Symmetry: C5
Subunit: 346 residues, 5 copies
């Protein structure tokens, strides 16, 4: 008969003595707020900034005995967010925020509904740009575990407790795709219970394994590196004599490997430790100098040589011939079987 | 006689028992909110970010029996947005927001007017920066269908229903032009009715086919690629002997194709799958190495050759002559008829 | 005697029945709001974004009979913007906003004063970043007409009318200078009266012819293009024989024209249609390949040639001599008289 | 005895008839607001945007007879900014704002204190990003005078007057250092009294001479330009004959001068008029083409030459020898004494 | 029995005469606010902008005798930030702000709790982007001391005093890692007590030594510089005669050192004084010109030389031989022992 907000106005109002400023079960057990998120959007992972943008549905669940209606014959009683500040709320935040906001588009995107026993369902939409450290040892082949963590600010452990729910504590959007990564489904859930001069505080937290898209930097960086190496070697399938063609076909290959290495570290954070993309290419550098080393190996022996003079020269021109046809691919094929296997097991 | 806002103040006020917190037809049928948009501005499609900026007029239409005036002799009774919060509103949002705002320029750009039976016309102006996935298989020749979707947050399906109206549910500005695309007029309208732990919620949604401007990357990337290919071949219309002109005219063409390929993938998202612009140019790469392959084919046979020695050499210098005048354009003209036809049918 | 705000408090207050929510002359003629702007700042025209930042003084003028004081012996009665929301205001906005704001620096920069008959002077300061389409056919020599337009949102035509005033409807700052353009003084003023499913709405609008600064891209792009063309031709004033100097002085000129063309389209929106800066330079490209075409024209005839063999060769070496000294400048001087005259009349 | 805010609450409250909406000395003399600023931070001068970020302490001083307490035995009575809106304030703004804000960090950074006679001390903290035109005729050697100006918005001249105070009207931070400039201590203070259709308004304004750091572009642009010029000339200290070393050492110098000129105008606004950095380098361009001009001067005379043929050739090879050893430095040393002296007197 | 906020409502309310506008111990001693921070996040040090982003927990501690409850049997009485504005707060700010904000994510991240004697614990979360000057004399090997400073705005020294606490006045996060630096644990704490026309104000301040990650620019800039120097010298281990290989292997090394120097100063602020990275590379420039100087030293003596003519030439070809094998590494090995030792002691 009576409208429920009118019933709610005398429920949580000054009548019935309800305060919005006091936690439920005060002078009693700590409040167990169980939670789960629905990731709407995810990504734009600025590895320069070492962070990621994510848009979630933060769902929060707890119970208030002060809000347990009895006579009203329904189960879930919703509330437009005008009266949302009139009730108690948790002091949730993120320990790795780096910028966030609500979404006031047409409405404060804020859900409330209350069970008969006062089980409080609370859902809001938050866009987060969460910082995460980026271990880039095997940089195109890393599985980044960028995390997120949810803590209480005023209420300590003894008055409030965050929880994950057991039934799928991270719901994921169906077409949630990543331009550069794959979100693995296994999402670790644990506690990061802090300690301060103030004291200790609750923390639930989530972990997100992100295996990359290997094929991109394969296309951009590996394959143009791959061409020059064979291009360095057909520059040994070049003519018998020390020609200016041997001069030109050598230096052309070297500058492109410098050029690809210039554009290699274009969007990278400036980590001290060596990553995987440069040792791919610095080896390709020291391979591409060997051809110019090989020409001077021809050129110094050509100047070393006139019967007996050139007799040693053309003999050494064959020891440089039949070995380099074998030694060039062998040092490169032994490189990849040395290279990829560590990056295949990690 | 009495001013209408004064009539409206006792209409929707505390007198006549009107609440802003309760949906119309409560404990009854779900509210059918029909809607249509007027796209003022559209574009700045950051394909790096895979999104698009759009400025709309979100028009919303429904009915409230609580707001049905009877005695007042007019039809549409407007309202400046001061009293807009005093009435019920829907909980509309976007499932792919990525940033939005209202427009408070001189006035909250918010329209209300009410029919005699309380049919509520509601219009606001929103700038959106809506995310959309970007399939870039045929990257200069794709028809991108970037979408947008409109959902309820608190009210489920059983209490609220979004609708498109039949009479032109997306109105488009007249001079709405795109710097890189064409908005096709056919705009698909359907439902994206979600399901959650909370439950199910209404969704109407719109789809926007965007065929590009083919001619730009034609000018920037195809035509400078086109010049080098013929420039590679007049470098076979070069002199009889293995000259340093054959050395210089070969390597000049190769580095520019590397240079255009460096500036090719300038503003591109890092997708794993191969797009169309690189297979345009990687083929142009492997074409441009064939000329340097052709010089060494001349150079190795020149070193292979003295009567019978040069007799085979000049004979092979003609088998490299009359075939390459035929084989060069034929492998390229067969490429484009292999290339464009798939990109002409999609 | 009594202070005027105290006189104003009983003027526009609840006493004397004044509403801020009702337009003047309600149930009567539409309100004629005449307006004019003072452009404080203007520019930073992001042609990539196809917009321009402008900071204006939006002056608005109309009349309210409800605000016509009688007994107070003065003419213009100002008001600090605290009481500005207490009166009626128009629902002005911009149809091409793309971001705007007010200016709360030390004070809401909001002017009100009221005549004896209630003629309302209303002035505020707005920074706008207004979108404008950019026709770039003659890109360094275009006169861009970037516009701005001012519409009503809730009030239709029959209740409200925007106007320009006759007496200089766009006031311009004195030292309002542009880094890349010239604002022509002639500013077209007309109507963009829209029509919707809602109905029709008033619009006044202004137009701004912007002729560029021609001399910049002259310096950056024309003059370095100009040097290579003569540098291509002194490479024909080179020695008699087909030298490696003819090889080196040719390819040096070609790569710089590629290099300038790489930096040519640095900050340009990706329009499909051809602009003027590339046809300046693509012609400079096909001129610079003619010198390498000319060397191979020497080189093929040098290999074509031994008495009668070289007799034709040196004769053709003179037909390539005396014609190219004439044919080189003539095709370029006929180009500019073909080029600039269309760009001098538009 | 009684707390002073309680004394202030009945001082400026509704009792004693104080209005915040009325200027002091109303229906009397115009209010003389004297002011001075303390520049906390200054710089990040985006010459592309032609503006500068500055963070100030805007101190404002005037007198209110309505706020002159009498009985309270102290001199300066401060006020936390909660009651700051309860009093009158000036309508100060900036005519060249381009974005600004207050600073609500832990507190509205807003100072009030009141003398016994009601002399009002008012100080706030503002970060400004102030636009300034950038005359770049002598671009590395200009003294930029970027200004700032402070005007009233509603109150005209006859009701309000801004002033500088005599005692150091611009206080400057001690370690206020600039990454690219030097703030000269002489700061011009004058009036920019505007005139409008509304009328005339007060303006005080400040001027800031900014002499650059000459040594940076000296290091980046002058010194690498300086090396090539001598590198062009040791390429004339090259061997007797027209060698391919003369070919290679010429073109190497030319492309670097193109390369430095490409990176020269990296961060520059696109002004039409010629600046100083390009005439530094375009002269360095036309110097570096003279060496390739000198080789062809050798090469054409080498092809011109066989007893009497080479006799003129080696004689002209000495007229090109002994003159160019003198003519090369002389045209460059006469250039700098032509160059720097205008840039030393301005 | 009675809830504590209800006890707090009559504690700090209008009853018991509590004002939020008056400092504690008014007309008495200055308030000693001791403080300490917990750095949550730190970094993204934009050396171009000369600043750093930091996210802190600003903890503030003082005492209010007005807030000393007596009868309530507990020690720390917390308060959700709704009633936070109802009490007195300090006027803290930062003198080097450059942008800051609070964090309203789900809750104003604002902590209050009050001891029995009214010792006020106050903690909030602030993200700061704090400016700091960047001395870049030894640019890859500098220890940057970027500071932060905390001042009062309205309250002077005689009414308010900031303090550090003795017990670890800067708490640091455990996994607080830097992408480019190391935060040294020693953090200097002192006073920056300002003086103005207003007067003098309290200041506590903190200092943060930041030693870089040396290994990055080692990898990016030192090692590619290191390769060319040996590559310059094997270009002297080249053949006996003045070959075009000596021409080509010289100029290839020079342009890469120009290319690395172009990408060297990519992200650097434009300081006038010379840094350490360029004197690393300008020496590498003047080393790499010596090889081309060495070829012309060969080439001029080759043209100087026919019995006695070449007899001096091959003798000078040995004085250029046996010295340069010794003189090349010696001038470079003496450089590094001159270089690094100053950068090892600072
Ligand atoms: C939130 O969840 C926590 C975790 O279960 C609850 O704390 C637990 O509360 C129960 C009953 O209140 C305690 O059980 C009792 O333990 C004593 C001693 O172990 C035993 O003698 C009794 O027979 C009884 O089983 C339990 O110890 C306690 N655990 C902890 C770690 O505190 C808490 O009550 C929940 N609060 C709310 C508001 O739901
Ligand atoms: C919003 O639109 C929906 C869709 O039409 C409306 O729901 C429909 O309401 C009508 C009448 O209220 C229902 O018709 C009735 O159906 C029963 C059983 O089918 C039949 O025996 C009756 O004779 C009568 O025709 C219809 O079933 C129902 N459809 C659905 C899917 O619920 C709704 O009433 C509209 N609400 C408002 C506020 O306009
Ligand atoms: C705002 O300006 C418009 C444009 O002038 C005003 O509308 C005009 O109002 C006048 C008098 O109210 C109308 O004149 C009358 O017209 C009738 C029929 O044409 C004629 O028989 C009468 O003798 C008289 O001249 C005029 O038609 C009308 N024009 C339009 C287009 O509506 C309007 O009144 C102004 N409103 C305010 C508040 O100033
Ligand atoms: C703010 O400063 C201005 C500038 O001094 C003040 O205006 C000046 O006010 C004085 C006295 O009120 C005027 O002096 C009188 O001038 C008349 C005619 O010149 C003379 O016959 C009298 O004997 C007396 O000296 C002075 O003219 C006037 N100047 C101007 C330019 O208006 C103003 O009063 C100050 N206002 C406040 C609130 O401090
Ligand atoms: C905040 O801390 C300051 C620093 O200690 C306190 O100021 C100090 O207050 C004490 C007692 O109020 C003063 O001691 C007295 O000094 C006089 C003269 O030196 C001496 O004759 C007395 O026997 C007594 O020892 C002390 O001088 C004073 N120091 C300064 C620099 O002012 C202040 O009281 C503290 N305020 C609060 C609210 O805690």
């Amino acid at each position: 008969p009576m409208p429920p907000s009118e019933f709610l106005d005398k429920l949580m109002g000054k009548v019935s003595g309800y305060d919005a400023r006091i936690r439920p079960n005060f002078k009693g057990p700590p409040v167990n707020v169980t939670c789960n998120i629905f990731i709407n959007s995810f990504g734009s992972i600025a590895e320069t900034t070492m962070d990621y943008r994510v848009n979630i549905f933060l769902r929060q669940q707890w119970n208030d005995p002060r809000l347990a209606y009895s006579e009203y014959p329904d189960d879930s009683l919703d509330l437009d967010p005008s009266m949302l500040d009139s009730i108690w709320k948790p002091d949730l935040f993120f320990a790795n925020e780096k910028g966030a906001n609500f979404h006031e588009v047409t409405t404060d995107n804020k859900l409330l509904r209350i069970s008969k026993n006062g089980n409080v369902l609370y859902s809001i939409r938050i866009t987060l740009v969460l910082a995460c450290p980026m271990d880039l040892k095997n940089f195109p082949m890393d599985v980044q575990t960028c995390i997120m963590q949810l803590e209480s600010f005023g209420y300590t452990m003894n008055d409030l407790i965050f929880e994950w729910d057991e039934k799928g504590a991270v719901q994921v959007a169906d077409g949630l795709t990543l331009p550069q990564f794959i979100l693995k489904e296994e999402k670790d859930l644990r506690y990061c219970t802090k300690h301060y001069n103030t004291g200790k505080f609750t923390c639930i937290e989530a972990r997100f394994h992100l295996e990359r898209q290997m094929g991109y930097y394969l296309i951009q960086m590996y394959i143009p590196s791959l061409l020059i190496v064979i291009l360095s070697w057909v520059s040994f399938w070049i003519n018998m004599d020390a020609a200016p063609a041997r001069v030109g076909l050598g230096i052309t290959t070297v500058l492109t490997m410098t050029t690809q290495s210039s554009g290699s570290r274009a969007s990278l954070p400036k980590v001290s430790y060596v990553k995987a993309i440069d040792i791919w290419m610095a080896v390709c550098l020291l391979f591409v100098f060997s051809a110019l080393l090989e020409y001077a190996a021809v050129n110094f022996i050509a100047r070393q040589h006139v019967e007996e003079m050139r007799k040693l020269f053309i003999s050494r021109a064959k020891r440089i011939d039949t070995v380099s046809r074998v030694a060039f691919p062998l040092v490169f094929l032994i490189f990849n079987i040395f290279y990829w296997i560590t990056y295949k097991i990690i």
